[PDB]
Amino acid sequence: DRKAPVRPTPLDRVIPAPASVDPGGAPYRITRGTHIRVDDSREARRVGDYLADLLRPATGYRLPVTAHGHGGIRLRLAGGPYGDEGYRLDSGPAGVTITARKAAGLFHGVQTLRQLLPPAVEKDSAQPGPWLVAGGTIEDTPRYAWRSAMLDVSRHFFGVDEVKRYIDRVARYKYNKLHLHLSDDQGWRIAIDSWPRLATYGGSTEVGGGPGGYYTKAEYKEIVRYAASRHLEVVPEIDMPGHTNAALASYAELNCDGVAPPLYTGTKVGFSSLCVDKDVTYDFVDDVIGELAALTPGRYLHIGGDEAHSTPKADFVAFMKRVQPIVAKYGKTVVGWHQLAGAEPVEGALVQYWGLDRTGDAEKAEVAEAARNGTGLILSPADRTYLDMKYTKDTPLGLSWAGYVEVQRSYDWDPAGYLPGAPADAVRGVEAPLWTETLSDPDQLDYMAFPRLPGVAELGWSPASTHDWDTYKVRLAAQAPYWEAAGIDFYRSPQVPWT
Ligand SMILES: CC(=O)N[C@@H]1[C@@H](O)[C@H](O)[C@@H](CO)O[C@H]1O
């Protein structure tokens, strides 16, 4: 009965592991007459409508959302110790109530609710259920505030609808930030009015050749809006001064020798550089950052900084000294890859650590030192949470430069004690990046993102006391019939005892 169990899933069998699970009593059962009762506010109705949309196809129930009466599913905003993102979920014969201080907390409780319901909830046509929700109480708040997924749309372009699909994948696991890698050597993916060839020329291809693509400002705004409705803050990245061939190919004047390189369709890294010694470089960066900041309601702007291997170290330092303030000039907080730690992060900056177990002590120390100097740390180790990395030598997609990363390796660590010498309170959270050198359609993104994506979300969300591979893998195994019913391809790791 994998597909429609006789009994409800246990209250604690959700990912991320909730901070507190107190099972008891009889379950709630959704039936054809169940109403979704919300507060009389637009933002409460928005979460109710989102929930109703998730449940209508598989139940075939009306599930009206209203602000009157005693509905069997109640979403309510109230004072409580749940913070900006936490919630309480109460379940029993009298109904399900999700209580939070903010809409994002109600939204997170909905993500829990959809895992308490059975896998048939994922289907697009009406199903018998039964639509049971285990009885008891869950109280849940996040460990870290930076819980991020990245999608590379530079190596292969993914359009608005494909990004919305990826957004809905990550929303399941309470990620709250979406990092978009909007430019690299093989593509420039955001239209800039002051430099119109970036998109029309630099966006014209991708890895492997053929058509590429880019977002108009209207499309980018729609991605941001859709992400916001799934409580994801969009963090855009324009990588500089390396990984810049698409821009360089578009404007001859940006290049050291004044010659535009060809458009690049390979998969090498490290070979491109903005010209640090030319004034037009900083006009360009200021134009791009200013236009991107105007489209970005979130707090953060990512300037990259990785693999500027055609930029001599002293020039990289000078470049970063000059461009970091452009970000604050347009009202945003700088984020960069942890190479920025070698180039004097400005106050308030965060750096994203993509090192590995084998990274040298000196490099780790430079990052721990920036943490001591007040730089926030985002942890996305390339041998842990890079979702493009192969599971084993036989994986048919992805890369292997960081070694192989099976499911247990991806999950089985503690952000608080990961980087030697780094103060635990400098760790802002975690990110799971999905690079797309090898991935050109949404099914391939699913196969590499799943099943490690929920594990990185748990590292960002769950208390360290709940962390345990042997019991986590049981909760992970339980996702198989959900993913199967939803059409989500995933790697059936032999480490996981799949349901
Ligand atoms: C910060 C970073 O990750 N840089 C590159 C990235 O451009 C590339 O897509 C990835 C593939 O795993 O390998 C890294 O070396």
Coordinates of C-alpha atoms and ligand atoms in Angstrom, one line a residue:
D1 CA 0.0 0.0 0.0
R2 CA 3.0 2.3 -0.7
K3 CA 0.8 4.6 -2.8
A4 CA -2.2 4.9 -0.5
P5 CA -1.3 3.6 3.0
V6 CA -3.9 2.2 5.4
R7 CA -2.5 4.3 8.3
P8 CA -1.1 7.9 8.3
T9 CA 2.6 8.7 8.1
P10 CA 4.1 9.3 11.6
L11 CA 4.0 12.9 12.7
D12 CA 7.8 13.1 12.9
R13 CA 8.5 11.6 9.4
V14 CA 9.1 14.9 7.6
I15 CA 12.1 16.7 6.2
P16 CA 13.5 19.0 7.6
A17 CA 13.2 17.2 10.9
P18 CA 10.9 19.5 12.9
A19 CA 12.4 21.1 16.1
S20 CA 9.6 19.5 18.3
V21 CA 7.2 16.7 17.5
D22 CA 4.6 15.5 20.1
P23 CA 2.5 12.8 18.6
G24 CA -0.8 11.8 20.2
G25 CA -4.5 11.1 19.7
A26 CA -6.4 10.4 16.6
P27 CA -5.6 11.9 13.2
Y28 CA -7.5 14.5 11.2
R29 CA -9.1 13.3 8.0
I30 CA -9.8 15.8 5.2
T31 CA -13.2 15.1 3.7
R32 CA -15.2 16.7 0.8
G33 CA -16.7 19.4 2.9
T34 CA -13.5 20.7 4.5
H35 CA -13.0 24.5 4.4
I36 CA -9.7 26.3 4.7
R37 CA -10.3 29.1 7.2
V38 CA -7.8 32.0 7.1
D39 CA -7.6 35.5 8.7
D40 CA -9.3 38.3 7.0
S41 CA -6.1 39.6 5.2
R42 CA -4.7 39.3 1.7
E43 CA -1.6 37.6 2.9
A44 CA -3.5 35.0 4.9
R45 CA -5.8 34.3 1.9
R46 CA -2.6 33.9 -0.2
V47 CA -1.4 31.0 1.9
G48 CA -4.8 29.5 2.0
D49 CA -5.2 29.7 -1.8
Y50 CA -1.7 28.2 -2.2
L51 CA -2.7 25.2 0.0
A52 CA -6.1 24.8 -1.7
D53 CA -4.3 24.7 -5.1
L54 CA -2.0 22.0 -3.8
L55 CA -4.8 19.8 -2.5
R56 CA -7.6 20.3 -5.1
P57 CA -6.4 18.0 -7.9
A58 CA -5.7 14.9 -5.9
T59 CA -8.7 15.2 -3.5
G60 CA -11.1 16.6 -6.1
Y61 CA -12.5 18.7 -3.2
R62 CA -13.7 22.2 -3.5
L63 CA -11.7 23.4 -0.5
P64 CA -13.0 27.0 -0.4
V65 CA -10.8 29.5 1.3
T66 CA -12.6 32.0 3.6
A67 CA -12.3 34.2 6.6
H68 CA -15.5 33.1 8.3
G69 CA -16.5 30.0 10.2
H70 CA -14.7 27.1 11.9
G71 CA -12.9 25.4 9.0
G72 CA -11.3 22.0 9.4
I73 CA -8.0 23.4 8.2
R74 CA -7.2 26.7 10.0
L75 CA -4.3 29.0 9.2
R76 CA -3.9 31.7 11.8
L77 CA -1.5 34.6 12.5
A78 CA -1.0 35.1 16.2
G79 CA 1.7 36.1 18.7
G80 CA 3.9 33.2 19.7
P81 CA 7.5 32.0 20.0
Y82 CA 7.8 31.1 16.4
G83 CA 9.9 34.0 14.9
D84 CA 9.6 35.2 11.4
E85 CA 9.5 31.7 9.9
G86 CA 8.4 29.2 12.5
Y87 CA 4.9 27.7 13.2
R88 CA 2.8 25.4 15.3
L89 CA 0.8 22.6 13.7
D90 CA -2.0 20.9 15.7
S91 CA -3.8 17.9 14.3
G92 CA -6.7 15.8 15.5
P93 CA -10.4 15.0 14.9
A94 CA -11.3 18.6 15.5
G95 CA -9.1 19.8 12.7
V96 CA -5.6 20.9 11.6
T97 CA -4.5 24.4 12.8
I98 CA -1.3 26.0 11.7
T99 CA -0.4 29.0 13.8
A100 CA 2.5 31.4 13.1
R101 CA 3.5 35.1 13.5
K102 CA 4.0 35.6 9.8
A103 CA 2.8 34.3 6.4
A104 CA 6.2 32.6 5.9
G105 CA 5.6 30.6 9.0
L106 CA 2.1 29.5 7.7
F107 CA 3.7 28.6 4.4
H108 CA 6.3 26.5 6.2
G109 CA 3.6 24.7 8.1
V110 CA 1.9 23.9 4.8
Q111 CA 5.2 22.3 3.6
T112 CA 5.0 20.1 6.7
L113 CA 1.3 19.3 6.2
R114 CA 1.9 18.1 2.6
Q115 CA 4.3 15.5 3.9
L116 CA 1.9 14.3 6.6
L117 CA -0.6 13.6 3.9
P118 CA -0.2 10.5 1.8
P119 CA 1.7 10.3 -1.5
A120 CA -1.5 10.3 -3.5
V121 CA -1.7 14.0 -2.7
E122 CA 0.9 14.5 -5.4
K123 CA -1.4 13.2 -8.2
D124 CA -3.2 15.5 -10.6
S125 CA -6.5 13.5 -10.7
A126 CA -8.9 12.7 -7.9
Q127 CA -7.8 9.8 -5.6
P128 CA -9.5 7.9 -2.8
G129 CA -7.1 9.0 -0.2
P130 CA -7.7 8.6 2.7
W131 CA -6.5 12.1 3.5
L132 CA -5.1 11.6 7.0
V133 CA -2.9 13.8 9.1
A134 CA -1.3 12.2 12.1
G135 CA -2.5 13.5 15.5
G136 CA -0.5 15.6 17.8
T137 CA 1.5 18.9 17.9
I138 CA 4.6 20.1 16.0
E139 CA 6.4 23.2 17.0
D140 CA 9.0 24.2 14.5
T141 CA 11.6 27.1 14.0
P142 CA 14.8 27.2 11.9
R143 CA 18.3 26.9 13.1
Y144 CA 19.8 29.2 10.4
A145 CA 18.3 32.1 8.5
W146 CA 20.3 31.5 5.2
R147 CA 18.8 28.4 3.6
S148 CA 19.5 28.7 -0.1
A149 CA 19.4 26.9 -3.4
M150 CA 21.3 28.1 -6.4
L151 CA 20.4 27.5 -10.1
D152 CA 23.0 28.0 -12.8
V153 CA 21.1 29.5 -15.8
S154 CA 24.3 30.6 -17.6
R155 CA 25.7 27.2 -18.6
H156 CA 22.4 26.1 -19.9
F157 CA 19.5 28.6 -19.9
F158 CA 16.3 27.7 -18.2
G159 CA 13.2 29.9 -19.0
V160 CA 10.8 31.5 -16.5
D161 CA 8.5 28.4 -16.4
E162 CA 11.4 26.0 -15.8
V163 CA 12.7 28.3 -13.0
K164 CA 9.2 28.4 -11.5
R165 CA 9.3 24.6 -11.6
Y166 CA 12.6 24.5 -9.8
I167 CA 11.3 27.0 -7.2
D168 CA 8.4 24.7 -6.5
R169 CA 10.9 21.8 -6.0
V170 CA 12.9 23.7 -3.4
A171 CA 9.9 25.3 -1.7
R172 CA 9.0 21.8 -0.4
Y173 CA 11.9 21.8 2.0
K174 CA 11.7 25.3 3.5
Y175 CA 14.5 27.0 1.6
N176 CA 14.1 30.7 1.9
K177 CA 16.7 32.0 -0.6
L178 CA 17.1 31.4 -4.4
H179 CA 20.5 32.3 -5.7
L180 CA 20.5 32.8 -9.5
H181 CA 23.8 32.5 -11.4
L182 CA 22.8 35.0 -14.1
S183 CA 26.1 35.3 -16.0
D184 CA 29.2 33.3 -16.8
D185 CA 31.5 32.5 -19.7
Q186 CA 28.8 30.7 -21.8
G187 CA 25.9 33.2 -21.3
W188 CA 24.6 36.5 -20.0
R189 CA 21.1 36.0 -18.8
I190 CA 19.6 39.4 -17.8
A191 CA 18.8 42.3 -20.2
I192 CA 20.7 45.5 -19.3
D193 CA 19.3 48.6 -21.0
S194 CA 22.6 50.5 -21.0
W195 CA 24.5 47.5 -22.5
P196 CA 21.9 45.9 -24.8
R197 CA 24.3 43.4 -26.5
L198 CA 25.0 41.6 -23.2
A199 CA 21.6 39.8 -23.6
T200 CA 21.1 39.8 -27.3
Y201 CA 24.7 38.7 -28.1
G202 CA 26.1 37.4 -24.9
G203 CA 22.9 35.5 -24.2
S204 CA 22.7 34.0 -27.7
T205 CA 24.2 30.6 -26.9
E206 CA 25.1 28.2 -24.1
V207 CA 27.2 25.2 -23.3
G208 CA 27.2 22.9 -26.4
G209 CA 26.1 25.7 -28.8
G210 CA 22.8 26.4 -30.3
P211 CA 20.2 28.8 -28.8
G212 CA 20.7 30.3 -25.4
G213 CA 18.3 32.8 -23.9
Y214 CA 18.0 35.5 -21.3
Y215 CA 15.4 37.2 -19.1
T216 CA 13.9 40.5 -20.0
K217 CA 13.4 42.8 -17.0
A218 CA 9.7 41.8 -17.0
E219 CA 10.6 38.1 -16.9
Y220 CA 13.1 38.6 -14.1
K221 CA 10.5 40.6 -12.1
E222 CA 8.1 37.7 -12.6
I223 CA 10.6 35.2 -11.3
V224 CA 11.1 37.4 -8.3
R225 CA 7.3 37.7 -7.8
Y226 CA 6.8 34.0 -8.1
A227 CA 9.7 33.3 -5.8
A228 CA 8.4 35.7 -3.2
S229 CA 5.0 34.0 -3.3
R230 CA 6.9 30.8 -2.3
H231 CA 8.8 32.8 0.4
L232 CA 12.1 32.7 -1.5
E233 CA 14.2 35.9 -1.5
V234 CA 16.0 36.0 -4.8
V235 CA 19.8 36.6 -4.6
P236 CA 21.1 37.4 -8.1
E237 CA 24.7 36.9 -9.1
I238 CA 26.8 38.7 -11.7
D239 CA 30.1 37.0 -11.4
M240 CA 33.1 39.2 -11.6
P241 CA 35.9 39.8 -12.6
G242 CA 36.3 36.2 -13.7
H243 CA 33.6 34.0 -15.4
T244 CA 33.0 37.1 -17.6
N245 CA 33.4 35.8 -21.2
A246 CA 29.8 36.5 -22.2
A247 CA 30.1 40.2 -21.4
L248 CA 33.6 40.3 -22.9
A249 CA 32.4 38.7 -26.1
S250 CA 29.7 41.3 -26.4
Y251 CA 31.8 44.5 -26.0
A252 CA 35.3 44.5 -27.5
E253 CA 36.1 47.6 -25.4
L254 CA 35.9 45.6 -22.1
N255 CA 38.9 43.4 -23.1
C256 CA 42.5 44.1 -22.2
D257 CA 43.5 43.9 -25.9
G258 CA 40.3 45.6 -27.1
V259 CA 39.3 42.5 -29.0
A260 CA 36.1 40.6 -28.2
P261 CA 36.7 36.9 -27.7
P262 CA 34.4 34.5 -29.5
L263 CA 31.3 33.4 -27.7
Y264 CA 32.2 30.4 -25.5
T265 CA 30.4 27.0 -25.6
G266 CA 32.9 24.8 -23.7
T267 CA 33.1 23.9 -20.0
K268 CA 36.5 25.2 -18.9
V269 CA 36.7 27.7 -16.0
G270 CA 39.3 30.3 -15.0
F271 CA 40.3 31.8 -18.4
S272 CA 38.3 35.1 -18.6
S273 CA 38.9 38.4 -16.8
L274 CA 37.5 41.9 -16.9
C275 CA 40.3 44.4 -17.6
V276 CA 41.1 45.7 -14.2
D277 CA 43.3 48.5 -15.6
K278 CA 40.7 50.2 -17.8
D279 CA 38.2 52.8 -16.6
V280 CA 35.3 51.5 -18.8
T281 CA 35.3 48.4 -16.6
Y282 CA 34.0 50.3 -13.6
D283 CA 31.4 52.2 -15.7
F284 CA 30.2 48.8 -16.9
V285 CA 30.0 47.3 -13.5
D286 CA 28.2 50.3 -12.0
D287 CA 25.7 50.3 -14.9
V288 CA 25.0 46.5 -14.4
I289 CA 24.8 46.5 -10.6
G290 CA 22.6 49.6 -10.6
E291 CA 20.1 48.1 -13.1
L292 CA 20.1 44.8 -11.3
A293 CA 19.7 46.3 -7.8
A294 CA 16.6 48.2 -9.1
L295 CA 15.0 44.8 -10.0
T296 CA 16.0 43.2 -6.8
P297 CA 13.7 43.7 -3.8
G298 CA 15.8 41.4 -1.6
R299 CA 18.7 42.5 0.6
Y300 CA 21.6 40.8 -1.2
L301 CA 23.5 41.1 -4.4
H302 CA 26.1 38.4 -5.3
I303 CA 29.2 39.6 -7.2
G304 CA 30.8 36.2 -7.4
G305 CA 34.6 36.4 -7.4
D306 CA 35.5 32.8 -7.9
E307 CA 38.2 31.5 -10.3
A308 CA 39.5 34.8 -11.4
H309 CA 42.6 32.9 -12.5
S310 CA 43.4 35.3 -15.4
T311 CA 43.4 38.2 -12.8
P312 CA 46.6 38.6 -10.9
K313 CA 46.0 38.5 -7.2
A314 CA 46.9 42.2 -6.7
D315 CA 44.5 43.2 -9.4
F316 CA 41.8 41.0 -8.0
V317 CA 42.2 42.8 -4.6
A318 CA 42.2 46.2 -6.3
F319 CA 39.1 45.3 -8.4
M320 CA 37.2 44.1 -5.3
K321 CA 38.2 47.2 -3.3
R322 CA 36.7 49.3 -6.0
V323 CA 33.5 47.3 -6.9
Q324 CA 32.2 46.2 -3.4
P325 CA 31.1 49.8 -2.6
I326 CA 29.0 49.9 -5.8
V327 CA 26.7 47.4 -4.1
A328 CA 26.2 49.5 -1.0
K329 CA 25.8 52.5 -3.3
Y330 CA 22.6 50.9 -4.7
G331 CA 21.3 49.9 -1.3
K332 CA 22.3 46.2 -1.1
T333 CA 24.5 43.8 0.9
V334 CA 27.5 42.2 -0.9
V335 CA 27.8 38.5 -1.2
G336 CA 30.7 36.8 -2.9
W337 CA 32.4 33.5 -3.2
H338 CA 35.0 32.9 -0.4
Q339 CA 37.8 34.2 -2.6
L340 CA 36.5 37.6 -1.5
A341 CA 37.9 36.8 2.0
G342 CA 41.3 37.4 0.4
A343 CA 40.2 40.8 -0.8
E344 CA 39.0 42.6 2.3
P345 CA 35.2 42.1 2.6
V346 CA 33.4 45.3 3.3
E347 CA 31.3 45.6 6.5
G348 CA 28.1 43.5 6.3
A349 CA 29.4 41.3 3.5
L350 CA 28.8 37.6 3.4
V351 CA 31.0 35.0 1.7
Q352 CA 30.0 31.7 0.3
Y353 CA 32.5 28.9 1.1
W354 CA 32.7 26.3 -1.6
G355 CA 35.9 24.5 -0.4
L356 CA 36.3 20.9 0.4
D357 CA 37.7 18.5 3.1
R358 CA 41.0 18.6 1.2
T359 CA 41.2 22.3 0.8
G360 CA 44.5 23.6 2.2
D361 CA 44.8 24.9 5.7
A362 CA 45.8 28.4 4.6
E363 CA 42.7 28.8 2.5
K364 CA 40.4 27.6 5.3
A365 CA 42.1 30.0 7.7
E366 CA 41.6 33.0 5.5
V367 CA 37.9 32.3 5.5
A368 CA 37.7 31.6 9.3
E369 CA 39.6 34.9 9.8
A370 CA 37.0 36.8 7.8
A371 CA 34.3 35.2 10.0
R372 CA 36.2 36.5 13.0
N373 CA 36.3 39.9 11.4
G374 CA 32.4 39.9 11.2
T375 CA 31.9 38.5 7.6
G376 CA 28.9 36.1 7.5
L377 CA 29.6 32.6 6.2
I378 CA 27.4 30.7 3.8
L379 CA 28.5 27.0 3.7
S380 CA 28.2 25.2 0.4
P381 CA 31.2 22.8 0.3
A382 CA 31.8 21.4 -3.2
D383 CA 32.3 17.9 -1.8
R384 CA 29.0 18.1 0.1
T385 CA 26.2 20.3 -1.4
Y386 CA 27.2 20.8 -5.0
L387 CA 24.2 19.0 -6.6
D388 CA 26.0 18.8 -9.9
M389 CA 28.6 16.4 -8.4
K390 CA 28.3 12.7 -9.4
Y391 CA 27.1 10.3 -6.8
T392 CA 29.5 7.6 -8.0
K393 CA 31.8 7.0 -11.0
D394 CA 28.9 5.6 -12.9
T395 CA 26.5 8.6 -12.5
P396 CA 25.5 9.5 -16.1
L397 CA 25.3 13.3 -15.6
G398 CA 27.3 15.8 -13.5
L399 CA 31.0 16.3 -12.7
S400 CA 33.6 14.6 -10.6
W401 CA 36.3 17.1 -9.9
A402 CA 35.3 17.3 -6.2
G403 CA 35.3 13.5 -5.9
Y404 CA 32.0 11.6 -5.6
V405 CA 29.2 12.7 -3.3
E406 CA 26.7 10.1 -2.2
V407 CA 23.7 10.9 -0.2
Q408 CA 25.1 10.2 3.3
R409 CA 28.2 12.4 2.6
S410 CA 26.0 15.3 1.5
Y411 CA 24.0 15.1 4.7
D412 CA 26.4 13.9 7.4
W413 CA 28.0 17.0 8.8
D414 CA 27.4 19.9 11.1
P415 CA 27.6 23.5 9.8
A416 CA 28.4 24.8 13.3
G417 CA 31.6 22.8 13.6
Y418 CA 32.6 22.5 9.9
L419 CA 35.2 25.1 9.1
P420 CA 38.2 24.8 11.6
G421 CA 38.6 27.8 13.7
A422 CA 35.5 29.6 12.5
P423 CA 33.1 31.0 15.2
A424 CA 29.8 29.2 15.1
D425 CA 27.9 32.5 15.3
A426 CA 29.4 33.7 12.0
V427 CA 27.7 30.8 10.1
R428 CA 24.6 32.3 8.5
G429 CA 23.5 29.0 7.0
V430 CA 23.9 26.7 4.0
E431 CA 23.4 26.6 0.2
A432 CA 22.9 23.7 -2.3
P433 CA 24.2 24.9 -5.7
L434 CA 23.1 23.2 -9.0
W435 CA 25.6 24.0 -11.8
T436 CA 24.4 23.2 -15.3
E437 CA 27.4 22.4 -17.5
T438 CA 25.9 18.9 -17.9
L439 CA 22.2 19.6 -17.4
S440 CA 20.0 20.9 -20.1
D441 CA 16.4 20.0 -19.2
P442 CA 14.3 20.0 -16.1
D443 CA 14.2 16.3 -15.6
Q444 CA 18.0 16.2 -15.5
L445 CA 17.9 18.9 -12.9
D446 CA 15.6 16.7 -10.8
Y447 CA 17.9 13.7 -11.1
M448 CA 20.9 15.6 -9.8
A449 CA 19.0 17.7 -7.2
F450 CA 17.1 14.7 -5.7
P451 CA 17.6 13.1 -3.2
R452 CA 20.3 15.3 -1.7
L453 CA 18.3 18.6 -1.9
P454 CA 16.1 17.8 1.2
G455 CA 19.2 16.9 3.2
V456 CA 20.8 20.3 2.7
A457 CA 17.5 22.0 3.6
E458 CA 17.6 20.0 6.9
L459 CA 21.1 21.2 7.7
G460 CA 19.8 24.7 7.3
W461 CA 16.6 24.2 9.3
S462 CA 16.7 21.4 11.9
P463 CA 18.3 21.5 15.3
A464 CA 21.7 19.7 15.5
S465 CA 20.1 17.4 18.1
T466 CA 17.9 15.9 15.4
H467 CA 20.8 15.2 13.1
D468 CA 21.4 11.5 12.5
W469 CA 22.1 9.6 9.3
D470 CA 20.5 6.3 10.4
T471 CA 17.2 7.8 11.2
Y472 CA 17.3 10.6 8.5
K473 CA 17.7 8.0 5.8
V474 CA 14.3 6.5 6.9
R475 CA 12.6 9.8 6.5
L476 CA 14.3 10.3 3.2
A477 CA 13.4 6.8 2.0
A478 CA 9.7 7.7 2.7
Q479 CA 9.8 10.4 0.0
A480 CA 10.1 7.9 -2.9
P481 CA 6.3 7.3 -3.5
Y482 CA 5.7 11.1 -3.2
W483 CA 8.4 11.8 -5.8
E484 CA 7.1 8.9 -8.0
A485 CA 3.6 10.3 -7.9
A486 CA 4.8 13.8 -8.6
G487 CA 6.9 12.8 -11.6
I488 CA 10.2 13.9 -9.8
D489 CA 13.1 11.8 -11.0
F490 CA 15.7 11.0 -8.4
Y491 CA 18.8 8.9 -7.9
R492 CA 17.8 5.7 -6.1
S493 CA 20.9 5.6 -3.9
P494 CA 21.8 2.2 -2.5
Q495 CA 22.5 4.0 0.8
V496 CA 18.8 4.7 1.3
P497 CA 16.2 2.0 2.2
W498 CA 13.6 3.3 -0.3
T499 CA 9.9 2.9 0.5
Ligands
LIG1 C1 32.3 28.8 -7.4 C2 32.3 27.6 -8.3 O1 31.7 26.6 -8.1 N1 33.0 27.7 -9.5 C3 33.0 26.7 -10.5 C4 31.7 26.6 -11.2 O2 31.7 27.8 -12.1 C5 31.5 25.4 -12.0 O3 30.2 25.4 -12.6 C6 31.6 24.3 -10.9 C7 31.1 22.9 -11.4 O4 31.1 22.1 -10.3 O5 32.9 24.2 -10.5 C8 33.5 25.3 -9.9 O6 34.8 25.2 -10.0

